[PDB]
């Protein structure tokens, strides 16, 4: 009879996992402060990793990799890409980015301007975007820097993909979401089901003031978009439809044109930090679900946007995926008395 505690009531994902765990009749939920637990569904911020693996007779498991914030923070991801030789500063799947601290606080202000002045002089598309974890699109560097100073937190400026792949009919932008699960053995499993959070507004390149046809977030389309739900239910096109489209329109498959680049990026990011966050020889074990967001341009090239360390799931995929977490992540360390729904990305540890 295994025991677990819940410390993040807002997690839609693990609320289902906890619901499923109890459905097995072999897992028992305890109070969120009872230290005798085999599994912790921990809080997001300030999860006390240092208190794990010190209870005699209990093999404890947590659903977060300590140090994975280096990859799920806008500014941290930039530093990690530029400084890490595995990814190098010339990594070809990540938009040119720079760390820009507001002037009321190292910083790459001048480094960005040099690259900006080079694009402004060479007649090249010089449209950037600023944002932070706590958005403004502009072609004038003056408007991007003045916006950051008006805030009090760190920001990041990166190149804006001006030639994004537009779905038809509609002529609309979009992004792709892939859920990735790493277990205690640091196996990288990719969920066979992705989602395209599409923009219900026709992409427009001569006006970055209105951010409804540029930002493909499920909330902005359902709040600031007028054609929400026209082409697909909930501005979400799953792999089946999107793959059929790539075949009728572009005469190719989602595997060859996009998925190979996605699987290559996932491996590169996770393998890079394996020495820093692995729990191979640690007194407790970790596993964590990740959410990668990619962009696809008109050349069918994939670009990495950001990595989410506490993502939600598409409504139609909560059951399948949640159950999958319980199979390869939890019960793999706490067995119970297919055709995997994942794609194992073999790698060298």
């Amino acid at each position: 009879m295994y025991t677990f505690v819940v410390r993040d009531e807002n997690s839609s994902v693990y609320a289902e996992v906890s619901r499923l765990l109890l459905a097995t009749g072999q897992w028992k939920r305890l109070r969120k402060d009872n230290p005798r637990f085999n599994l912790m569904l921990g809080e997001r911020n300030r999860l006390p990793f240092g208190r794990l693996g010190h209870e005699p007779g209990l093999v404890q498991l947590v659903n977060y990799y300590r140090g994975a914030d280096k990859l799920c923070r806008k500014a941290s991801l930039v530093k990690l890409i530029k400084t890490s030789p595995e990814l190098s500063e010339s990594c070809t799947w990540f938009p040119e980015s720079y760390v820009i601290y507001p002037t009321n606080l190292t910083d790459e202000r001048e480094v960005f301007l040099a690259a900006y002045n080079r694009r402004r002089e060479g007649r090249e598309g010089n449209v950037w975007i600023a944002k932070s974890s706590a958005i403004l699109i502009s072609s004038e560097a003056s408007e991007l820097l003045d916006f950051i100073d008006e805030q009090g937190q760190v920001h990041v400026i990166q190149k804006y993909l001006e030639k994004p792949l537009l779905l038809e009919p509609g002529h609309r932008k979009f992004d792709i979401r892939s859920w990735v699960l790493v277990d205690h053995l640091y196996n990288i499993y990719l969920y066979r089901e992705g989602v395209l959070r599409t923009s219900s507004e026709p992409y427009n390149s001569a006006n970055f003031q209105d951010k409804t046809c540029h930002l493909t977030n499920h909330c902005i389309q359902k709040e600031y978009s007028k054609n929400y739900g026209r082409y697909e239910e909930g501005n979400e096109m799953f792999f089946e439809e999107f793959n059929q489209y790539l075949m009728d329109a572009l005469n190719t498959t989602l595997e060859n044109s996009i998925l190979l680049q996605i699987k290559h990026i996932i491996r590169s990011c996770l393998m890079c930090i394996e020495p820093a966050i692995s729990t191979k020889h640690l007194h407790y074990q970790s596993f964590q679900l990740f959410g990668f967001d990619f962009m696809v341009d008109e050349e069918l090239k994939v670009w990495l946007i950001e990595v989410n360390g506490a993502p939600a799931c598409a409504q139609k995929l909560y059951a399948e995926l949640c159950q999958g977490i319980v199979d390869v992540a939890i019960s793999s360390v706490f067995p119970l008395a297919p055709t995997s729904i994942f794609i194992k990305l073999h790698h060298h540890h």
Binding site: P48, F49, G50, R51, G53, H54, P56, R66, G67, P275, A276, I277, H281, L282, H283
Partner: protein, 437 residues
């Protein structure tokens, strides 16, 4: 030659002292009767082993040790054991009833009545020192004596020996090898009142010693003798510089200078390798780089924690056996490119290396196998603060209900000393977090 007086307090301190001086004797070739054939100067001399051993005209080499316990059962074994002849009776001090695992009892109730007696015996060893360096204090956190009387002793030593250094070897509490429930209280009480009196302290987590014995030595249920023989191997590696010829850590002053740039943050993390089981007929002898790389594995640390998520302030590598400088630096390169070793920017990203050619000495019939080379890493990581967090949390759970507080108040301690002590740990944790994040 400057001398070092070692003080063993409580059951843990005395038993650990029993395993260390046993080892000091096998290393320096001192027999149970106190004789040392290799020592050619009879009844004197300022050699390196004289920092820990005095000499009688009859050729006996007497440790510079003081054993204190509020109950006589544990020290009584020493008085009739293998090494009953090394010590003279003045060195062993025993009361008649212990502190009942009660910090207040060992500190106030019983401590007041015997403190002046201990200081007197200590003054006798000091009177045999031409240039006393300082004291090595061995004690437990959970013990009522280890925690209660030690903190009182430290306060007094700072008064009677101002300009002298004081290092601690502290035993961190672990449930698997303890029957006491109130050890978090005692731990946080003694760390609070001992902090400003200790220049450098090496915490050993019994949880770590236990698993190293079960994992490496295949001991299903280790005994204190098993735990202690291992603990003294690390202690020997830490004090080897003071007892043998060398240039690194030659006196106790060099331990704060080399490992503690900030005063309150004086708790280095110890990492030792290799620990091999003697039952193995023969084992592949590990290389310099292999044993070095192990120094950054959590599985050989004296306190289970993740140095990858801290920041180093210093780092000493102590080598014993067949090792040359060329080999050390080679492995160092290979590890920085593979490992996460983030220093604080106001500290040099460097390592101080010590090499002693005599390989580790093993107790005949002990649990550890003979090895050609071994290393002990002393690193000042913010990651050890994890141990304070675990302990402080256990303190919070109980104190929120005032459980067991009456036993302490009943010995004359004020309840306010609890919150005054806990708030000091809260300040200790903040310092680490400020230096690391």
């Amino acid at each position: 030659m400057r001398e070092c007086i070692s003080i063993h307090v409580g059951q843990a301190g005395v038993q650990i002292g029993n395993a260390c001086w046993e080892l000091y004797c096998l290393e320096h070739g001192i027999q149970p009767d106190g004789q040392m054939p290799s020592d050619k100067t009879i009844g004197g001399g300022d050699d390196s082993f004289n920092t820990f051993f005095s000499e009688t005209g009859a050729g006996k080499h007497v440790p510079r040790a003081v054993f204190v316990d509020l109950e006589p059962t544990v020290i009584d074994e020493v008085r009739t054991g293998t090494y009953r002849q090394l010590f003279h009776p003045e060195q062993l001090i025993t009361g008649k009833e212990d502190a009942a695992n009660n910090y207040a009892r060992g500190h106030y109730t019983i401590g007041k009545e015997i403190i002046d007696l201990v200081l007197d015996r200590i003054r006798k060893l000091a009177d045999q020192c031409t240039g006393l360096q300082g004291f090595l204090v061995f004690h437990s956190f959970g013990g009522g004596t280890g925690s209660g009387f030690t903190s009182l002793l430290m306060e007094r030593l700072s008064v009677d020996y101002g300009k002298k250094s004081k290092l601690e070897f502290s035993i961190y509490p672990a449930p698997q090898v303890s029957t006491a429930v109130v050890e978090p209280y005692n731990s946080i009480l003694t760390t609070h009142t001992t902090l400003e009196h200790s220049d450098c302290a090496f915490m050993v987590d019994n949880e770590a010693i236990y698993d190293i014995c079960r994992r490496n030595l295949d001991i299903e249920r280790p005994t204190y003798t098993n735990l202690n023989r291992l603990i003294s191997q690390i202690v020997s590696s830490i004090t080897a510089s003071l007892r043998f010829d060398g240039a690194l850590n030659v006196d106790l002053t060099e331990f704060q200078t080399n490992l503690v740039p900030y005063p309150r943050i004086h708790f280095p993390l110890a990492t030792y390798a290799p620990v091999i089981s003697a039952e193995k007929a023969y084992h592949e002898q590990l290389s310099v780089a292999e044993i070095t790389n192990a120094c950054f594995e959590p599985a050989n640390q004296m306190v289970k924690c993740d140095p990858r998520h801290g920041k180093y302030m210093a780092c000493c590598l102590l080598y014993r056996g067949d090792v040359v400088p060329k080999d050390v630096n080679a492995a160092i390169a290979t590890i920085k490119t593979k490992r996460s070793i983030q220093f604080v920017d106001w500290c040099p990203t460097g390592f101080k290396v010590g090499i002693n050619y005599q390989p580790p000495t093993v107790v005949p019939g002990g649990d550890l196998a003979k090895v050609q080379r071994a290393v002990c890493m002393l690193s000042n990581t913010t990651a050890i603060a994890e141990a304070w967090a675990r302990l402080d949390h256990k303190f919070d759970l109980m104190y929120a209900k005032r459980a067991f507080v009456h036993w302490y108040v009943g010995e004359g301690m004020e309840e306010g000393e609890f919150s005054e002590a806990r708030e000091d740990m809260a300040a200790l944790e903040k310092d680490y977090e400020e230096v690391g994040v």
